[PDB]
Amino acid sequence: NDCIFEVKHEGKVMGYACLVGDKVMKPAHVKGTIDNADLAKLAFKRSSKYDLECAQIPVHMKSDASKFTHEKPEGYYNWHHGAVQYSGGRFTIPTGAGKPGDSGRPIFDNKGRVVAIVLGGANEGARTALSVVTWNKDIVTKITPEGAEEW
Amino acid sequence: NDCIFEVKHEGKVMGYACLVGDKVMKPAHVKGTIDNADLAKLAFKRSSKYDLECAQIPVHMKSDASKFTHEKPEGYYNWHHGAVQYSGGRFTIPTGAGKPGDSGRPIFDNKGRVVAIVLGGANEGARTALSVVTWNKDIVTKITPEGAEEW
Domains of chain A by residue range:
1-66, 67-151
Contact A59/B88, CB-based, under 8 Å? no
Contacts of A61 in chain B (CB under 8 A): 124-125
The rounded distance, in Å, linking the Cα atoms of A91 and A133 is 11
The CB-side HSE value for B96 (13 A sphere, CA atoms) comes to 2
Are B108 and B75 within 8 A, CB to CB?
no
Please give the backbone phi and psi of residue A61, each rounded to the nearest 5 degrees, phi first. -100, 15
Are A140 and A52 within 8 A, CB to CB?
yes
Residue A81 annotated to the active site: no
Selection from B7, B25, B4 nearest residue B140 by Cα = B25
Q: Is A6 exposed, middle or buried (0-12, 13-18, 19+ CB in 10 A)?
A: middle
Are A148 and A122 within 8 A, CB to CB?
yes
Residue B63 annotated to the active site: no
Catalytic residue among B2, B9, B22, B29: B29
Q: Is B65 exposed, middle or buried (0-12, 13-18, 19+ CB in 10 A)?
A: middle
For the CA atoms of B85, B89, B90, B91, the dihedral, rounded to the nearest 10 degrees, stands at 30
Selection from A99, A100, A107, A65 nearest residue A82 by Cα = A107
- What is the enclosing helix (H) or strand (E) of B92? strand B91-94
- Dump strand ranges (E) for chain A: 4-9, 12-20, 23-27, 33-34, 45-47, 52-56, 67-68, 75-79, 82-86, 91-94, 106-108, 113-121, 127-136, 139-143
Q: How far is CA B118 from CA A9, A143, B82, B107, B134, in A?
A: 47, 44, 14, 8, 9
Give B130 to chain A, closest Cα distance, Å: 14
The technique is cryo-EM
Are B74 and B54 within 8 A, CB to CB?
no
The rounded distance, in Å, linking the Cα atoms of B63 and B57 is 11
The rounded distance, in Å, linking the Cα atoms of B90 and A67 is 13
Give chain A's radius of gyration (CA, Å).
15
CA distance between the termini of chain A = 21
Are A63 and A1 within 8 A, CB to CB?
no
Are B68 and B79 within 8 A, CB to CB?
no
List CB contacts of A25: < 8 A, sequence separation 6 or more.
A17, A18, A19, A52, A53, A54, A104, A117
Give A59 to chain B, closest Cα distance, Å: 7
